[PDB]
Amino acid sequence: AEVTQLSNGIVVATEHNPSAHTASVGVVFGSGAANENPYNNGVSNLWKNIFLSKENSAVAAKEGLALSSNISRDFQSYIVSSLPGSTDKSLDFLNQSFIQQKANLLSSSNFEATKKSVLKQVQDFEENDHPNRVLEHLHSTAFQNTPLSLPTRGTLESLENLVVADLESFANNHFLNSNAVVVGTGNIKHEDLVNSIESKNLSLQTGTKPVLKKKAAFLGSEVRLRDDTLPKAWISLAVEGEPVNSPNYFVAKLAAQIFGSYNAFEPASRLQGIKLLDNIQEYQLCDNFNHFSLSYKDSGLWGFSTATRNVTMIDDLIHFTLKQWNRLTISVTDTEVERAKSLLKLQLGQLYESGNPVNDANLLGAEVLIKGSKLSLGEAFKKIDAITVKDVKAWAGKRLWDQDIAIAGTGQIEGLLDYMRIRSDMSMMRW
Amino acid sequence: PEHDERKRLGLKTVIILSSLYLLSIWVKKFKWAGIKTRKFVFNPPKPRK
Numbered sequence: 287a288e289v290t291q292l293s294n295g296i297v298v299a300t301e302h303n304p305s306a307h308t309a310s311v312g313v314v315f316g317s318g319a320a321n322e323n324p325y326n327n328g329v330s331n332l333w334k335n336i337f338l339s340k341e342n343s344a345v346a347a348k349e350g351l352a353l354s355s356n357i358s359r360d361f362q363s364y365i366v367s368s369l370p371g372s373t374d375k376s377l378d379f380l381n382q383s384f385i386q387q388k389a390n391l392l393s394s395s396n397f398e399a400t401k402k403s404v405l406k407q408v409q410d411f412e413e414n415d416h417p418n419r420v421l422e423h424l425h426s427t428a429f430q431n432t433p434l435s436l437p438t439r440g441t442l443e444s445l446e447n448l449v450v451a452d453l454e455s456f457a458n459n460h461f462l463n464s465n466a467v468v469v470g471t472g473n474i475k476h477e478d479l480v481n482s483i484e485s486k487n488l489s490l491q492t493g494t495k496p497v498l499k500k501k502a503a504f505l506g507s508e509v510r511l512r513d514d515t516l517p518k519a520w521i522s523l524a525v526e527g528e529p530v531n532s533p534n535y536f537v538a539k540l541a542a543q544i545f546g547s548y549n550a551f552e553p554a555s556r557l558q559g560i561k562l563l564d565n566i567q568e569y570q571l572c573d574n575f576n577h578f579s580l581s582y583k584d585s586g587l588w589g590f591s592t593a594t595r596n597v598t599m600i601d602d603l604i605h606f607t608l609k610q611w612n613r614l615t616i617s618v619t620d621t622e623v624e625r626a627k628s629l630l631k632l633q634l635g636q637l638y639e640s641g642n643p644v645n646d647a648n649l650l651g652a653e654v655l656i657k658g659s660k661l662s663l664g665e666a667f668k669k670i671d672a673i674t675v676k677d678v679k680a681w682a683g684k685r686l687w688d689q690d691i692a693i694a695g696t697g698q699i700e701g702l703l704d705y706m707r708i709r710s711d712m713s714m715m716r717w
Numbered sequence: 718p719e720h721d722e723r724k725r726l727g728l729k730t731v732i733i734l735s736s737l738y739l740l741s742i743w744v745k746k747f748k749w750a751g752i753k754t755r756k757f758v759f760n761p762p763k764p765r766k
Contacts, residue, residue, distance in 0.1 A: 515766060704751070704752075705751050706748060706751060
């Protein structure tokens with residue numbers, strides 16, 4: 287259980303697992319939706335779907351190869367999967383169809399067919415997926431007029447004016463050897479992957495990606511998208527949090543685990559050791575909530591999201607939740623900290639030790655692109671067990687107590703009160 | 718016979734109340750700044766409903 291990195295001008299990372307039955311090989315780039323502008327937003331989402339189109343997936347299926355891809359704000363992925371004794375064929379396909387030749391993929395017929403499907407994907411998302419479009423709107427009001435505001439799928443208006451030239455320009459600027467990591471997970475040995483690469487030569491482009499003029503900045507604000515015909519209210523609320531490669535990275539994750547997640551219709555979720563639940567269940571002000579701590583290269587967010595059918599008691603839900611947050615500065619106990627320690631270990635122990643090599647490749651490539659190295663799971667546990675009550679109170683006194691907030695909501699949100707009555711609940715006035 | 722005392726207690730009272738009136742104008746305009754610059758946009762929906 288250890289990763290091995292080498293460099294030849296091309297970075298090559300690998301987590302070998304001898305007891306698996308598959309192998310994944312791919313390339314991860316260090317540019318995401320936070321590396322484009324409002325005019326070409328969605329060009330990366332359209333690159334993913336050109337990779338996964340028919341005539342490229344057909345050519346892989348005849349050889350016994352499956353394909354995958356993912357777009358995020360800091361990185362992109364293009365992965366190939368196979369049986370363990372078929373990994374050299376995986377690398378060849380990744381060489382031919384992607385890095386060297388792509389005139390086949392950017393044809394006039396394949397481009398229009400791909401654009402039609404992607405527009406239908408995005409239009410469907412904006413009309414039916416309410417919890418996820420409110421979290422995207424939160425990012426856009428918190429980080430307005432900065433690169434961390436742009437949605438990852440793109441916007442239906444900017445996505446309509448794209449041509450092949452926009453794709454080719456974006457490729458020449460960001461798909462570069464200086465901005466790339468080659469990964470390998472599952473039943474694959476490091477030496478074999480290194481040997482297979484030097485037998486070929488395998489370079490995409492040289493480097494010099496553009497530098498981004500503006501840095502990400504948090505701004506307290508709100509955006510309300512009112513729709514009285516929907517049957518619920520969906521709300522998300524956050525403060526500024528921690529970026530990746532911060533000293534307070536695990537302390538913010540432990541603090542989110544203290545308040546946790548809830549489903550009203552599951553019996554065992556009603557019995558969790560969370561003091562907020564003593565307040566909501568007597569009048570049943572929500573159906574579910576979840577606390578998050580999101581982290582990027584430049585900034586982060588810390589907060590919660592909720593959905594509810596009780597549209598006359600929204601102000602009691604927001605009030606009781608924000609008063610529990612105040613206790614992290616003033617009166618958090620030792621039992622609440624020892625519970626969140628061991629449940630955080632179980633959480634990220636399941637994220638980093640699933641059975642899917644595709645998830646391993648995305649995690650590995652994104653971490654090595656920032657830190658140059660991966661922190662093992664035995665090391666992360668020791669940092670978590672060394673946190674005390676004093677560290678939590680010091681973090682909360684700086685990040686939560688009387689600080690500005692960002693809010694987004696949709697649906698039946700008449701009962702959501704104004705900004706300054708919610709902002710005033712961030713301090714207790716009884717301390 | 719209260720003329721001299723009255724005119725001196727009224728100097729104290731008018732100075733205190735005059736500054737409270739200016740402080741109250743400051744505090745109000747700060748707590749009202751969100752409402753005064755709030756913005757609205759309309760996109761006509763589809764009349765399917």
